[PDB]
Design an enzyme around this catalytic site. Structure first.
Site, PDB file in Angstrom:
ATOM      1  N   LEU A  11       0.861  -1.201   0.000  1.00 18.87           N
ATOM      2  CA  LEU A  11       0.000   0.000   0.000  1.00 18.87           C
ATOM      3  C   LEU A  11       0.897   1.251   0.000  1.00 18.87           C
ATOM      4  CD1 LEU A  11      -2.719  -1.440   2.373  1.00 18.87           C
ATOM      5  CD2 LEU A  11      -2.805  -1.130  -0.110  1.00 18.87           C
ATOM      6  N   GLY A  12       2.098   1.152   0.570  1.00 17.80           N
ATOM      7  CA  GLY A  12       3.087   2.254   0.588  1.00 17.80           C
ATOM      8  C   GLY A  12       4.165   2.049   1.641  1.00 17.80           C
ATOM      9  N   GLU A  13       5.145   2.958   1.698  1.00 20.79           N
ATOM     10  CA  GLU A  13       6.232   2.955   2.716  1.00 20.79           C
ATOM     11  C   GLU A  13       5.959   4.127   3.662  1.00 20.79           C
ATOM     12  N   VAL A  19       3.819  -0.741   4.424  1.00 19.29           N
ATOM     13  CA  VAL A  19       2.409  -1.182   4.669  1.00 19.29           C
ATOM     14  C   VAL A  19       1.904  -2.108   3.552  1.00 19.29           C
ATOM     15  CG1 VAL A  19       0.018  -0.373   5.082  1.00 19.29           C
ATOM     16  CG2 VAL A  19       1.947   0.779   6.166  1.00 19.29           C
ATOM     17  N   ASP A 120       3.350  14.956  10.525  1.00 18.16           N
ATOM     18  CA  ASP A 120       3.577  14.567   9.102  1.00 18.16           C
ATOM     19  C   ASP A 120       2.244  14.535   8.363  1.00 18.16           C
ATOM     20  OD1 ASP A 120       5.238  14.137   6.941  1.00 18.16           O
ATOM     21  OD2 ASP A 120       5.356  11.952   7.307  1.00 18.16           O
TER      22      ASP A 120
HETATM   23  C1  U0K Z   1      -7.716  -0.348   0.026  1.00 16.24           C
HETATM   24  C2  U0K Z   1      -6.617   0.606  -0.291  1.00 16.24           C
HETATM   25  C3  U0K Z   1      -5.818   1.334   0.575  1.00 16.24           C
HETATM   26  N1  U0K Z   1      -5.940   1.326   1.953  1.00 16.24           N
HETATM   27  C4  U0K Z   1      -5.032   1.669   2.895  1.00 16.24           C
HETATM   28  N2  U0K Z   1      -5.377   1.468   4.186  1.00 16.24           N
HETATM   29  C5  U0K Z   1      -4.486   1.734   5.165  1.00 16.24           C
HETATM   30  N3  U0K Z   1      -4.857   1.546   6.446  1.00 16.24           N
HETATM   31  C6  U0K Z   1      -3.251   2.306   4.793  1.00 16.24           C
HETATM   32  C7  U0K Z   1      -2.105   2.848   5.470  1.00 16.24           C
HETATM   33  C8  U0K Z   1      -1.931   2.865   6.884  1.00 16.24           C
HETATM   34  N4  U0K Z   1      -1.875   2.876   8.062  1.00 16.24           N
HETATM   35  C9  U0K Z   1      -1.239   3.312   4.468  1.00 16.24           C
HETATM   36  N5  U0K Z   1       0.021   3.935   4.553  1.00 16.24           N
HETATM   37  C10 U0K Z   1       1.143   3.741   3.633  1.00 16.24           C
HETATM   38  C11 U0K Z   1       2.313   4.137   4.495  1.00 16.24           C
HETATM   39  C12 U0K Z   1       1.736   5.253   5.371  1.00 16.24           C
HETATM   40  C13 U0K Z   1       0.320   4.774   5.714  1.00 16.24           C
HETATM   41  C14 U0K Z   1      -0.719   5.876   5.865  1.00 16.24           C
HETATM   42  N6  U0K Z   1      -1.816   3.139   3.241  1.00 16.24           N
HETATM   43  C15 U0K Z   1      -1.265   3.537   1.951  1.00 16.24           C
HETATM   44  C16 U0K Z   1      -3.042   2.515   3.412  1.00 16.24           C
HETATM   45  N7  U0K Z   1      -3.905   2.200   2.437  1.00 16.24           N
HETATM   46  C17 U0K Z   1      -4.940   2.044  -0.244  1.00 16.24           C
HETATM   47  N8  U0K Z   1      -5.152   1.782  -1.526  1.00 16.24           N
HETATM   48  N9  U0K Z   1      -6.191   0.895  -1.544  1.00 16.24           N
HETATM   49  C18 U0K Z   1      -6.683   0.354  -2.801  1.00 16.24           C
HETATM   50  C19 U0K Z   1      -5.577  -0.389  -3.563  1.00 16.24           C
HETATM   51  C20 U0K Z   1      -4.871   0.762  -4.266  1.00 16.24           C
HETATM   52  O1  U0K Z   1      -5.801   1.845  -4.366  1.00 16.24           O
HETATM   53  C21 U0K Z   1      -7.053   1.432  -3.826  1.00 16.24           C
END
Ligand code: U0K
Ligand code: CL
Ligand code: CL
EC number: 2.7.11.1
Length: 261
Positions: A11-13, A19, A120
């Site tokens: 999902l990301g760093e 994550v 942040d």
């Molecule tokens: C379901 C979904 C998410 N959902 C999600 N849910 C979280 N709970 C975190 C989370 C934390 N905690 C996080 N990150 C990355 C590092 C920093 C942190 C905020 N990220 C980036 C999180 N993304 C992000 N994209 N998609 C879908 C797949 C790609 O597009 C739609």
């Protein structure tokens, strides 16, 4: 265990770690798992995460450790991040930006009220649930600024340069709350303009000088209506002691303007 969870994708760093979308091998419940390879930092993040209970802050489920690896479990945000709702060079419709900004302020009021500064705030860290409700996530830089009703000043530089307040680059010690207010104003700029105003709020940065000299006929400011721009004039004030506080943001004309979905 590698037996209980399937890591489907990144999902990301985060500020400190990375994550994954984890799917439960038994129930197929999908969560967000932060994967931490290696400290005193993680103990403090887990403790802050356990404090959190608000509709505009990410849900923490819990943690596991296996050796030099640790796992943090959170509510998967089905709407993804605010970052992905911002169209480069356009932003997003002003009513959507106002609703997100209302929800961002509600979450920040909550954090500040329990004596926590995020440090942040940026669109990568602002997540969306299935009803597009904003959730403040990533507590890896979060710290206590108020305890037993006494404020402590911050004395550490951290965050993301385009989002940091100018005092963080200049002062040995500074107040936590105006730094988080600043970063919310950069988020608002991003939502309304789909671009960041400067690399960093330093006199050596021409775009920052241009703003101090009130050249709002330049981008990104000329993309922004006069009312939200009047709010950004109060938020993006260099002297943190002259900067608008959240109680006064709640009185702002744009903040209180009825806008059509
Ligand atoms: C379901 C979904 C998410 N959902 C999600 N849910 C979280 N709970 C975190 C989370 C934390 N905690 C996080 N990150 C990355 C590092 C920093 C942190 C905020 N990220 C980036 C999180 N993304 C992000 N994209 N998609 C879908 C797949 C790609 O597009 C739609
Ligand atoms: Cl981009
Ligand atoms: Cl952006």
């Amino acid at each position: 265990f590698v037996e209980d969870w399937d890591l489907v994708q990144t999902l990301g760093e985060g500020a400190y770690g990375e994550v994954q979308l984890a799917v439960n091998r038994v129930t197929e419940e999908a969560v967000a798992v932060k994967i931490v390879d290696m400290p005193e930092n993680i103990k403090k993040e887990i403790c802050i995460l356990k404090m959190l209970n608000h509709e505009n802050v990410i849900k923490f489920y819990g943690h596991r450790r296996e050796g030099n690896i640790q796992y943090l479990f959170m509510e998967l945000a089905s709407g993804g991040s605010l970052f992905d709702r911002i169209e480069p060079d356009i932003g997003m419709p002003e009513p959507d930006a106002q609703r997100f900004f209302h929800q961002l302020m509600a979450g920040v009021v909550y954090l500040h009220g329990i004596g926590i500064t995020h440090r942040d705030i940026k669109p990568h860290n602002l997540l969306l649930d299935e009803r597009d409700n904003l959730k403040i996530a990533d507590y890896s830089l979060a710290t206590v600024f108020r305890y037993n009703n006494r404020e402590r000043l911050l004395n550490k530089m951290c965050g993301t340069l385009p989002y940091v307040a100018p005092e963080l680059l200049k002062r040995r010690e500074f107040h936590a709350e105006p730094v988080d207010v600043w970063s919310c104003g950069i988020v608002l700029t991003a939502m309304l303009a789909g671009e960041l105003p400067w690399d960093q709020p330093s006199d050596s940065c021409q775009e920052y000088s241009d703003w101090k000299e009130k050249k709002t006929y330049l981008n990104p400011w000329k993309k922004i209506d006069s009312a939200p721009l009047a709010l950004l004039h109060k938020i993006l004030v260099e002297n943190p002691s002259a900067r608008i506080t959240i109680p006064d943001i709640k009185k702002d004309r744009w903040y209180n303007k009825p806008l059509k979905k």
